[PDB]
Design a protein around this ligand. Structure first.
Ligand SMILES: [K+]
Ligand SMILES: [K+]
Ligand SMILES: [K+]
Ligand SMILES: [K+]
Ligand SMILES: [K+]
Ligand SMILES: [K+]
Ligand SMILES: [K+]
Ligand SMILES: [K+]
Ligand SMILES: [K+]
Ligand SMILES: [Mg+2]
Ligand SMILES: [Mg+2]
Ligand SMILES: [Mg+2]
Ligand SMILES: [Mg+2]
Ligand SMILES: [Mg+2]
Ligand SMILES: [Mg+2]
Ligand SMILES: [Mg+2]
Ligand SMILES: [Mg+2]
Ligand SMILES: [Mg+2]
Lengths: 274, 131, 63, 85, 96
RNA sequence: GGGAGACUUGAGUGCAGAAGAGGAGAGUGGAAUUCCAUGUGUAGCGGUGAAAUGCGUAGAUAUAUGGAGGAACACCAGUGGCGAAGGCGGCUCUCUGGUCUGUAACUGACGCUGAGGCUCGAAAGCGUGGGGAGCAAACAGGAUUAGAUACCCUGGUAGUCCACGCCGUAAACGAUGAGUGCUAAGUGUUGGAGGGUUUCCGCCCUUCAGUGCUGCAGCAAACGCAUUAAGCACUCCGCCUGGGGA
């Protein structure tokens, strides 16, 4: 659940966090841990390509099995663990043959659940099936766009998608964004919705916490200089003072669509949203 | 629940007299028997009788109506109530309608009328007025 | 006369379309008990049975 | 459940056939209260059933008060057996 | 225990072998979830009072079962019947 | 009144039965509206007292077939049922409260009321997060009018729906606190119980608990109430003391 801190200090005032009750252990699997360096939004050229990133707490990557392609044996859910790299929690599961792995934690997952993958798997939380075998109306997550590539859609905390129907070699899916689109029927997905549904309600509370979470301060364009931002310059506070608000590189900010107009996927996108 | 069985008995008699019923029946008790016998000997009620059952007994009262079916009992009033007990000293014994009625009183000499109570020069608890 | 009591049946199967038909009109509407001669208890039981039959497709909802 | 009720009655009967008594009634009501507490914790919005729960609690309190007024030793023994306060 | 009647409609196009396998599978589910199937029988192939999932005919099959109320046999049957394609519709009702 | 006893009518338990939109949880079914898509098809559709706004040749309205989604549950349906009240109406299952009728095995007054407290409490409203078909404050336009910040018409946001948590107010009304006992009848209806017939159905009598109407005694200022008292009585609680100010 969400625990709200008493206003002992102005920094602590109005702050809330997660009690991490669902978390069972704080010992990550050494075998599945991999090193990660903080790129701080800088590419191989060393240029800052994405602003407002850098600093923060060191993290280790937990290899998540988004593919869920080990259909032979079931996996016993051993622990629900905190993952610094993603909003949702992860789950350490042991395969009966002795292979240990991580998966995204679906809502309602419990330690001891015996999860299965493959066309014959039952329609239960945590199981993985090809979309063709998932009955209409089912709630799913961890949907893979290309067969064998591994789940890509619906992976953030609390997200979910709904199966709406079949057509040809495609399955109709409503994604968390509300966009309705076709996805190749041979693609797999996990039954249920991503756990940690409460993540959105957390009130960060202070700047230092964002810094911990690796967000550097964001500067409004209206307070920069003319050569720095289109909104920069002017005496005192000023309005946008342009036909439309624009990004630092002149791209309009409000309402201007950026999706490629000749994108191939348009053929598969049935109804858009956002 | 019933809290004043004496007042209940008085009200039963009052209603039966009002509709001019010939008889009435009540759950029995020592105080009720005393009141019934007092009325019997004072001529307010034609007759009294008792039936033995397995709860508390029953007391049956045969009312008295004069020529032209005129009601002998004009009314009854409960004086001492559970909410407020009423006690009178010997001098304070009340006269009902200048004696045309009666006041049933419980005293250390037993349950008696106001006439008897003031003749003996003792007070008590004024159970009821009858007239 | 209450047909249910007359036939002396205390159980009303929702499958007995034969029985349920005499208690609905054309258009499939349920008849008032004042019209069908039946009592309140049997009327309620018939209502439940007919609704279940409608749900299971044994009786039509309309027409 | 009737079987559970009967077994409790047999356990707490003051004597053969003692269906009604402070001990028997209080024990049965305590078991009912526990079960209904579980039910309420499952369905916190079941105010209508919670009212019946409160009525049971009140009746059990009245019976306990009567038992204490009557025989304090039996009252103490009963509360010790049933784990009450 | 409590007695339930489960009546469900099998899509008319089902093959005989498929129907037999389906009936056995669902009765097995009921048995495995701690419920005693006192009977299961194909009732009738009938016309529906209205179209259901594009069909106007259906095979009504009746399963009389008993179980403790707490037992999940009824819930599991409901879940799997809803998921399944062969069963157009189903209804479970307490009986005497 | 206190103490020591006994008793079963009050009260409760036991045993055998009855009905119910009682409550909560999770599902599910059809009608219909709206929208989306595709045919057919041509000039209106819509609406008023009359109009206009509006929608429509970018092909509407209509009509046919589908799809999505929200909300409420036609017929049954009834001063019918249930709940302390608010209120509860599609169907299914899980949990669950209460009520009533028998019997008389059990306890043996264990009961009533109940300030202060605690709980629930229509609609609107508030917070977080969802949902959002129809309706609809605000708002916009068109009419009306002297004016029309309205009635009327065309749209339409919050809200109306869900989960959680606040709010705790209503002509929250039977404008009638609860408990108990007594006092003509007549006639409906709901759930039982018993008996006398009746081949069963059913018909008659009795009786219990609700719900209605009519109507004695009595009460009332009158209106009217009248075994569901506003009559006759007792216990406890709440509340009133001219109108305004308030
Ligand atoms: K702060
Ligand atoms: K995290
Ligand atoms: K900023
Ligand atoms: K500036
Ligand atoms: K199905
Ligand atoms: K019940
Ligand atoms: K709201
Ligand atoms: K009646
Ligand atoms: K004054
Ligand atoms: Mg940024
Ligand atoms: Mg500057
Ligand atoms: Mg510039
Ligand atoms: Mg500028
Ligand atoms: Mg300036
Ligand atoms: Mg509301
Ligand atoms: Mg309007
Ligand atoms: Mg008020
Ligand atoms: Mg009556």
């Amino acid at each position: 659940a969400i625990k709200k801190y008493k206003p002992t200090t102005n920094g602590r005032r109005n702050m809330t966090s997660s009690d991490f009750a669902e978390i069972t252990t704080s010992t990550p699997e050494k075998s599945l841990l991999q090193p990660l360096k903080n790129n701080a939004g800088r590419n191989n050229n060393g240029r800052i390509t994405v602003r407002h990133q850098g600093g923060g707490h060191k993290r280790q990557y937990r290899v998540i099995d988004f593919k869920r392609n080990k259909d032979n044996v079931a996996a016993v859910v051993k622990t629900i663990e905190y993952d610094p790299n993603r909003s949702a929690n992860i789950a350490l599961v042991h395969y009966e043959d002795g292979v240990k792995a991580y998966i995204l934690a679906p809502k309602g997952l419990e330690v001891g659940m015996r999860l299965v993958s493959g066309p014959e798997a039952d329609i239960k939380v945590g199981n993985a099936l090809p979309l063709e075998n998932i009955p209409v109306g089912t709630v799913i997550h961890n949907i893979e766009m290309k067969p064998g590539k591994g789940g890509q859609l619906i992976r953030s905390a609390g997200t979910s998608a709904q199966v709406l129907g079949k057509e040809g070699k495609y399955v109709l899916i409503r994604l968390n964004s509300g966009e309705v689109r076709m996805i190749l029927a041979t693609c797999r997905a996990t039954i249920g919705s991503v756990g940690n549904e409460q993540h959105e309600l957390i009130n960060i509370g202070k700047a230092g916490r964002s810094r911990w979470m690796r967000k550097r301060p964001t500067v409004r364009g209206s307070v920069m200089n003319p050569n720095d931002h289109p909104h920069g310059g002017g005496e005192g506070k000023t309005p946008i003072g342009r036909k439309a608000p624009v990004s630092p590189w002149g791209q309009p900010a409000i309402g201007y669509k950026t999706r490629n107009k000749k994108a191939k996927s348009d053929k598969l996108i049935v109804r858009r949203r956002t | 629940v019933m809290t004043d069985p004496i007042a209940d008995f008085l009200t039963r008699i009052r209603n039966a007299n009002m509709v001019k019923h010939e008889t009435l029946e009540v759950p029995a008790s020592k105080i009720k028997r005393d009141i019934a016998e007092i009325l019997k000997r004072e001529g307010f009620i034609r007759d009294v009788e008792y039936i033995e059952d397995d709860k508390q007994g029953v007391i049956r009262v045969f009312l008295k109506y004069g020529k032209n079916e005129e009601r002998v009992i004009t009314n009854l009033k409960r004086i001492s109530k559970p909410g407020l007990r009423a006690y009178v000293k010997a001098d304070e014994v009340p006269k009902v309608l200048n004696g045309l009625g009666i006041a049933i009183i419980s005293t250390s000499e037993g349950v008696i009328t106001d006439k008897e109570a003031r003749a003996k020069n003792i007070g008590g608890e004024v159970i009821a007025y009858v007239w | 006369v209450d047909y249910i009591a007359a036939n002396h049946i205390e159980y009303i199967d929702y499958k007995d379309t034969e029985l349920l038909k005499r208690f609905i009109s054309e258009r499939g509407k349920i008849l008032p008990r004042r019209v069908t001669g039946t009592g309140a208890k049997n009327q309620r039981k018939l209502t439940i049975a007919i609704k279940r039959a409608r749900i299971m497709g044994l009786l039509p909802f309309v027409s | 459940s009737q079987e559970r009720k009967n077994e409790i009655i047999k356990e707490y009967a003051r004597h053969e056939g003692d269906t009604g008594s402070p001990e028997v009634q209080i024990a049965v009501l305590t078991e009912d209260i526990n079960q209904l507490n579980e039910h309420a914790r499952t369905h916190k919005k079941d105010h209508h059933s919670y009212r019946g729960l409160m009525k049971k609690i009140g009746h059990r309190r009245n019976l306990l008060a009567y038992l204490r007024k009557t025989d304090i030793q039996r009252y103490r023994e009963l509360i010790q057996r049933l784990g009450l306060r | 225990d409590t007695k339930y009647e489960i009546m469900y409609i099998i899509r008319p196009n089902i093959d005989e072998e498929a129907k037999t396998a389906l009936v056995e599978r669902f009765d097995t589910i009921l048995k495995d979830n701690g419920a005693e199937v006192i009977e299961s029988k194909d009732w009738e192939k009938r016309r529906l009072a209205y179209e259901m999932n594009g069909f106007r005919e259906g095979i009504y099959h009746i399963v009389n079962v008993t179980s403790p109320s707490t037992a999940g046999a009824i819930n599991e049957f409901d879940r799997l019947a809803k998921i399944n394609d062969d069963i157009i519709r189903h209804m479970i009702v307490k009986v005497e």
